[PDB]
Subunit: 354 residues, 2 copies
């Protein structure tokens, strides 16, 4: 049984961990972590010089990184070092496995804390437009994951999908952002036609420009809100990467996906790995982070639009039953051993004609 | 030796702890924690009703508080409860020992993260005026500590001080804010004359109004910047609660304090308990929090004024030597067993006439 003293100590340690997360975020954005990964043991002044930064700031940062047991300090020589085993997951050299990137979300949620608190009292939500930095970061992170794994790891989860794409299919990516996924797929699969759909006029224009740059005649982009579409029996394959649980009208989006698929078609929906039952998420790493991210961003943005507010932790069971509600009678859930955060939902449409 | 895997797990746990700190902050500001401390096990809807808050927000908050192992959830009945041993240090009923208050500093530092990051590149600092919420909270927290401990615990650390005040002394409080400390002392010690000095015209006016309210003829307030004072042999006793390490010109402030004291006088300076040597702070609870608070507030506000930027962790050794530089040849450091964050520096002035 946990005592008052033990709880006090655990919570003070959480406070220290929170400070440390912010320091790591600062370390990422300033290039300090990258800089120390390329240095031998060095003074505060040496580190600041190598980083091109103000030493007084670097010095205070170093102090907290040291008390947080990430940076190691040698008092005899007044030198600091970032152990290689830690550097390996806190630097840009790790790309999508750089955990310092996730640390940035602590400041990002903090920036909206007062706005979210108001919603506890007054209802509604904080609009999508309040989170430009948050969204920019998610887009960068997803770009790296698509580059690393989309073609060779993710698409092969769907039995027969790489051959179908090679042979030739009509494909859409719903919620395509700048069109990274469409770009990669259109390159890998010249026989297939790809349409990226996104709500942002800017993102769509950027997709179109980039497809023109690279001579990708088989990639087009279109601005639409995913809840209001006129696509009917248009696509053999539809991808949806992380977009559904944020929607104002997720059920209508899923219904639109089903309508847009041709008979024999397949939806690949990638969304957050968690249970729809709270008790199952207790003890699983990142569960608190996921509830917090939901409360302070993914849930509230949907509620701003008087939406469903399913949140980040909507969960496998609810996702599976909503796919059934949308008309899919054939749903499987795939996992990648090297991916703790995502489920890969594979939903196939009956071959039967209307 | 810590492995890559072990570091990965520890840092993911820090991320979860950071989320949990933000949730606790939200719990404090919304009254949710207070509400649950007065309830039996209850549903999300019951809790939201009791709190007067939007259930959908309460529900998501509950999820993260549960995965963070603060709130307990019973899946059989869908009820939540806040154990008494945890409630005891997360609710307003604990006053200055409410740890939920310290959790608010995570959002507060997050709100300034981008501004601080700019200073790593461009120098200078983030001005004091950027932190009104932060300062309001510190003032509330200090108010409660003064109410609880100033008269009966803190002032008795100085041998002979309560009797000297009872008998009659000229006293000043440097950095008095709204004048809480002066108010309490002026009430306890009718024979003594108290002057609160603060940089804020508003704080000073509020002090004066309140002294008029309560018929405290022996309490006055004056607006001055602590670095530029004309007080010479004016006071037998000077108090400085938490104000020195934030100053642009701390050495000049301490010199002004020494000049302002009469021969035989005493300074009571209360400031942060930590070492001036980084290696000593490693492993001490709250050290990371203190470096982070320094980097993102106390140090940077001083640097904004092209100041000393000593920071929150300036430390005992440096504080002691700066008191010597200011002219004090007689300095002791007192601790209160029930106070991990503050040192009590007692600096006495020679009895010898100019």
């Amino acid at each position: 049984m946990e005592t008052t003293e033990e709880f006090g100590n655990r919570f003070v340690a959480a406070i220290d961990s929170a400070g440390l997360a912010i320091l790591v975020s600062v370390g990422h954005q300033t290039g300090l972590l990258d800089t120390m990964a390329g240095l031998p043991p060095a003074t505060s002044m040496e580190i600041a010089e190598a980083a091109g930064l103000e030493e007084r700031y670097v010095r205070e940062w170093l102090g907290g990184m040291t008390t947080g047991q990430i940076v190691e300090y040698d008092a005899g020589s007044s030198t600091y070092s970032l152990p290689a085993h830690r550097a390996g997951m806190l630097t840009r050299a790790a790309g999508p496995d750089n955990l310092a990137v996730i640390a940035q979300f602590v400041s990002l949620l903090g920036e909206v804390e007062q706005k979210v608190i108001r919603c506890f009292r007054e209802g509604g939500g904080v609009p999508y437009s309040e989170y430009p930095r948050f969204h920019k970061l998610m887009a960068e992170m997803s770009g790296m994951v698509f580059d690393a794994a989309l073609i060779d790891v993710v698409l092969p989860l769907v039995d027969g999908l790489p051959d179908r794409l090679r042979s030739g299919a009509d494909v859409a990516d719903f919620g395509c952002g700048s069109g990274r996924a469409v770009k990669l797929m259109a390159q890998a699969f010249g026989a297939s036609r790809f349409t990226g759909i996104d709500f942002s006029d800017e993102a769509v224009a950027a997709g179109t420009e980039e497809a023109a740059r690279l001579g990708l005649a088989n990639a087009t982009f279109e601005r639409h809100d995913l809840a209001e579409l006129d696509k009917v029996g248009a696509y053999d394959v539809i991808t949806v990467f992380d977009a559904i649980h944020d929607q104002a009208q997720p059920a209508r989006v899923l219904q639109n996906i089903y309508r847009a698929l041709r008979p024999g078609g397949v939806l690949l929906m990638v969304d957050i790995k968690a249970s729809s039952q709270l008790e199952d998420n207790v003890g699983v790493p990142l569960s608190t982070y996921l509830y917090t991210t939901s409360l302070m961003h993914c849930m509230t943005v949907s509620l701003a639009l008087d939406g469903a507010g399913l949140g980040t932790v909507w969960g496998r069971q609810l996702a599976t039953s909503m796919l059934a509600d949308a008309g899919f009678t054939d749903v499987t859930v795939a996992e990648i051993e090297s991916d703790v955060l995502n489920n890969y939902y594979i939903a196939r449409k009956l071959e039967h004609h209307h």
